[PDB]
Design a binder for these strands. Structure first.
Ligand SMILES: [Mg+2]
Ligand SMILES: [Mg+2]
Ligand SMILES: [Mg+2]
Ligand SMILES: [Mg+2]
Ligand SMILES: [Mg+2]
Ligand SMILES: [Mg+2]
Ligand SMILES: [Mg+2]
Ligand SMILES: [Mg+2]
Ligand SMILES: [Mg+2]
Ligand SMILES: [Mg+2]
Ligand SMILES: [Mg+2]
Ligand SMILES: [Mg+2]
Ligand SMILES: [Mg+2]
Ligand SMILES: [Mg+2]
Ligand SMILES: [Mg+2]
Ligand SMILES: [Mg+2]
Ligand SMILES: [Mg+2]
Ligand SMILES: [Mg+2]
Ligand SMILES: [Mg+2]
Ligand SMILES: [Mg+2]
Ligand SMILES: [Mg+2]
Ligand SMILES: [Mg+2]
Ligand SMILES: [Mg+2]
Ligand SMILES: [Mg+2]
Ligand SMILES: [Mg+2]
Ligand SMILES: [Mg+2]
Ligand SMILES: [Mg+2]
Ligand SMILES: [Mg+2]
Ligand SMILES: [Mg+2]
Ligand SMILES: [Mg+2]
Ligand SMILES: [Mg+2]
Ligand SMILES: [Mg+2]
Ligand SMILES: [Mg+2]
Ligand SMILES: [Mg+2]
Ligand SMILES: [Mg+2]
Ligand SMILES: [Mg+2]
Ligand SMILES: [Mg+2]
Ligand SMILES: [Mg+2]
Ligand SMILES: [Mg+2]
Ligand SMILES: [Mg+2]
Ligand SMILES: [Mg+2]
Ligand SMILES: [Mg+2]
Ligand SMILES: [Mg+2]
Ligand SMILES: [Mg+2]
Ligand SMILES: [Mg+2]
Ligand SMILES: [Mg+2]
Ligand SMILES: [Mg+2]
Ligand SMILES: [Mg+2]
Ligand SMILES: [Mg+2]
Ligand SMILES: [Mg+2]
Ligand SMILES: [Mg+2]
Ligand SMILES: [Mg+2]
Ligand SMILES: [Mg+2]
Ligand SMILES: [Mg+2]
Ligand SMILES: [Mg+2]
Ligand SMILES: [Mg+2]
Ligand SMILES: [Mg+2]
Ligand SMILES: [Mg+2]
Ligand SMILES: [Mg+2]
Ligand SMILES: [Mg+2]
Ligand SMILES: [Mg+2]
Ligand SMILES: [Mg+2]
Ligand SMILES: [Mg+2]
Ligand SMILES: [Mg+2]
Ligand SMILES: [Mg+2]
Ligand SMILES: [Mg+2]
Ligand SMILES: [Mg+2]
Ligand SMILES: [Mg+2]
Ligand SMILES: [Mg+2]
Lengths: 62, 126, 46, 95, 18
RNA sequence: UCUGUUUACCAGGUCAGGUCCGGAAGGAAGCAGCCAAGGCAGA
RNA sequence: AGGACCGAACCGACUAAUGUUGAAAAAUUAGCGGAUGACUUGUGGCUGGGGGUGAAAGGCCAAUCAAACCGGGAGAUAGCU
RNA sequence: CGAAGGUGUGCUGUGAGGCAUGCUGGAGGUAUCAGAAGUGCGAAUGCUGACAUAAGUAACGAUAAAGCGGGUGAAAAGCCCGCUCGCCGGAAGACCAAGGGUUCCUGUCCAACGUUAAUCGGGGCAGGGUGAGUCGACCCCUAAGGCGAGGCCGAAAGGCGUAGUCGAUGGGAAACAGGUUAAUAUUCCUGUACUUGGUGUUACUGCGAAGGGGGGACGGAGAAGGCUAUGUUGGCCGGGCG
RNA sequence: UACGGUGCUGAAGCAACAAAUGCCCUGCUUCCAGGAAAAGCCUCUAAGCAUCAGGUAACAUCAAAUCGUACCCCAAACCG
């Protein structure tokens, strides 16, 4: 990823930010119950969030 | 109290009704902590179980702690099996005797509520 | 009988507590000596 | 209140006999929540994310224990538990 | 019933994981 | 010598269960239960 | 009325015994003195060592005091063992 | 095809020593002649470690006291349950502040900890437990006192102090009765309240401060008048005719 | 009834007397050794502002955060 994201506007970026967060929350809720098998899921999502914000930021500074 | 004659009855009653796909599905509480495949082959384990229990004399069955090395040699020889299977069967009767004493002392809801599944550290199986 | 140390947190802190050390020149020197000796805890806080 | 914040407050449902009994008798749910979360935030958050109506939220703070692992002395991180009271006509979804 | 299901469950089941 | 009961494996017979050999026919070692039998007794 | 009297809590600490590798680095038991006051006790604050504070005993200053403790001068100095 | 070391034995020098080999050991040693020393230990009321001795002796921490049946269990003087018995009762009971920090409750365990045994524990491991508009802190306000813009003072650091800002042990709004958890409750629940603010509506209307005043605002000792907490008796109510 | 408890129902629920160191009492009487401060609070106005702003009453509405809350406290949990 991360090229694909560089090509989306500020608006769609924050949209995917939100959706990413909902996903992460929902995830850690499942894993909370022990109803989640794939742990790797967590670390994907969490990282992905970062990607997003770091793009937003470089769109804000320059 | 609880005996290997009462376990004989529990076992020739349980080898009638029992299956491992009707027993691993009635719980999704320990099918998430333990592997869903670790149940058993029920026919083999309960036919070995009834073999090993039947091989016993009535004074060794009614009083399970008098079974020692020579008796396990002979239980292995009469059912035509391993002294190690006889061992781990006297061990499972030991745990279910433990658990029917813990259902006897504490009420059915306090010994069904304080029952614990455990991990040596919180990471999956490790 | 009545021994020397009678604990009171407030006294403990207003006396040897961190800010009380940040009060004076010699407080700040004690703190220096302490960091230089690589102390686990400088003052008594919690 | 902002939504990017609400998503970040509720860690996980806390289970216990105490919790259960509160659920059945008092129509209350129990949550491990962000250590810094405030009753307002929590209220708004459960009302949004779970789509239920909250009556009131009472919070308390668990102090972590102190355990020994291989002779070293550690301390579990502390946290905040919150009993959240749902209005009586509210039925409990778990997502 | 209650002691039939509490016997049977913990028996087949706790025969399994230990 | 009749009846009352006792004795795990390592005296005997039946040997359920189960197990070994065989595709199958069937055999087999034998644990338990029972009967001898050996302890101890009513006569 | 009262630095009045008798006497518990409270404050002390006169005599005896015990204890003295103690139940305790200053106590116990049995008695004893004051007990509306120059009384006592809580919480806080201030007084720093060639200094403090003393109803004054060189008393007390974290079980250390005719000059506290901690680091430094410092491997002081030792016609002594 | 067995080094250093360890440990026996044999031989040899006037001695400090040397040489050889049995066993152990399992990878390093080192002739000769030189060179340089943290170069030789029995004492130092020497230092650290280890282990003796007295000795299986003194002691087991208040002279309030136990006894029995039953339970569990490898094992019961100590655990749990029952019946007795004995001790405290202005405390040896109940509730807090200070201080401690999980000792609380439940399973589970008996190596070490417990001056004995331990199935028991404030011990081990695991889980659970601490719910507030009205309790307290936080906050509003000052005491002693602290810090102190400027300022005065001082070889330097610094000293004192104004305006201020802090500082409780004191002043400032308001909740009680019952029910419940294995462990919380004036917090949860049931019932009945109350407080100070923000917004609006209405009616009405002189509102405004870092300034003025009042109030908050205060000692000791004593007296004894009115009540209540609270207790005893009767009455009532349920039971008992021992 | 798992012998642990859970469930339903539930009588009467008064009078006298005694009586505090607690309450009236931050009172009262008296003595000399003559007994904190500041806020909230009630009122007066100045600067100001005036059909605005603001004050008072009633009804409605929303709010009242944050931390402590276990347990021990005449002790085996504190100082020894
Ligand atoms: Mg103190
Ligand atoms: Mg509430
Ligand atoms: Mg709270
Ligand atoms: Mg940590
Ligand atoms: Mg006198
Ligand atoms: Mg005293
Ligand atoms: Mg005395
Ligand atoms: Mg006296
Ligand atoms: Mg007197
Ligand atoms: Mg005083
Ligand atoms: Mg001098
Ligand atoms: Mg000097
Ligand atoms: Mg004096
Ligand atoms: Mg001294
Ligand atoms: Mg001096
Ligand atoms: Mg010297
Ligand atoms: Mg010199
Ligand atoms: Mg050699
Ligand atoms: Mg060498
Ligand atoms: Mg050698
Ligand atoms: Mg050799
Ligand atoms: Mg050698
Ligand atoms: Mg070898
Ligand atoms: Mg060399
Ligand atoms: Mg050499
Ligand atoms: Mg040389
Ligand atoms: Mg030397
Ligand atoms: Mg010598
Ligand atoms: Mg000596
Ligand atoms: Mg060593
Ligand atoms: Mg000895
Ligand atoms: Mg002797
Ligand atoms: Mg003797
Ligand atoms: Mg002695
Ligand atoms: Mg003795
Ligand atoms: Mg004792
Ligand atoms: Mg007994
Ligand atoms: Mg033992
Ligand atoms: Mg007994
Ligand atoms: Mg005893
Ligand atoms: Mg008893
Ligand atoms: Mg008595
Ligand atoms: Mg505390
Ligand atoms: Mg602990
Ligand atoms: Mg306990
Ligand atoms: Mg012991
Ligand atoms: Mg326990
Ligand atoms: Mg414990
Ligand atoms: Mg209050
Ligand atoms: Mg001042
Ligand atoms: Mg200045
Ligand atoms: Mg100053
Ligand atoms: Mg202030
Ligand atoms: Mg206060
Ligand atoms: Mg107050
Ligand atoms: Mg309690
Ligand atoms: Mg005034
Ligand atoms: Mg006052
Ligand atoms: Mg007066
Ligand atoms: Mg009355
Ligand atoms: Mg009657
Ligand atoms: Mg009832
Ligand atoms: Mg009084
Ligand atoms: Mg009083
Ligand atoms: Mg509480
Ligand atoms: Mg409590
Ligand atoms: Mg006391
Ligand atoms: Mg007490
Ligand atoms: Mg007590």
């Amino acid at each position: 990823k991360a090229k694909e994201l560089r090509e989306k506007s500020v608006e769609e970026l924050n949209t995917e930010l939100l959706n990413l967060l909902r996903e992460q929350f929902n995830l850690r809720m499942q894993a909370a119950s022990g109803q989640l098998q794939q742990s790797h899921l967590l670390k994907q999502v969490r990282r992905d969030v970062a990607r997003v914000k770091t793009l937003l930021n470089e769109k804000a500074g320059a | 109290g609880f005996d290997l004659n009462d376990f004989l009855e529990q076992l020739r009653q349980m080898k009638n009704m029992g299956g491992x796909x009707x027993x691993x599905x009635x719980x999704x509480x320990x099918x998430x902590x333990x592997x869903x495949x670790x149940x058993x082959x029920d026919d083999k384990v309960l036919v070995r179980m009834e073999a090993i229990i039947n091989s016993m004399t009535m004074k060794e069955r009614a009083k399970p702690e008098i079974i020692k090395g020579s008796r396990k040699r002979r239980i292995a020889a009469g059912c035509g099996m391993q002294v190690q299977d006889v061992n781990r069967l006297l061990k499972q009767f030991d745990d279910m005797q433990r658990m029917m004493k813990k259902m006897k002392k504490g009420g059915x809801x306090x010994x069904x509520x304080x029952x614990x599944x455990x991990x040596x550290x919180x990471x999956x199986x490790x | 009988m009545k021994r020397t140390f009678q604990p009171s947190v407030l006294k403990r802190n207003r006396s040897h507590g961190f800010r009380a050390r940040m009060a004076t020149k010699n407080g700040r020197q004690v703190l220096a000596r302490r960091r230089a000796k690589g102390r686990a805890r400088l003052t008594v806080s919690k | 209140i902002r939504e990017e914040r609400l998503l970040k407050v509720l860690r996980a449902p806390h289970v216990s006999e105490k919790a259960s009994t509160a659920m059945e008798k008092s129509n209350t749910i129990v949550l491990k929540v962000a250590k810094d979360a405030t009753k307002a935030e929590i209220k708004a958050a459960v009302q949004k994310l779970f789509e239920v109506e909250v009556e009131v939220v009472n919070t308390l703070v668990v102090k972590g224990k102190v355990k020994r692992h291989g002779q070293r002395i550690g301390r579990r991180s502390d946290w905040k538990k919150a009993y959240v009271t749902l209005k009586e006509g509210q039925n409990l979804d778990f997502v | 019933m209650k002691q039939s299901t509490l016997a049977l469950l913990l028996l087949l089941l706790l025969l399994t994981p230990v």
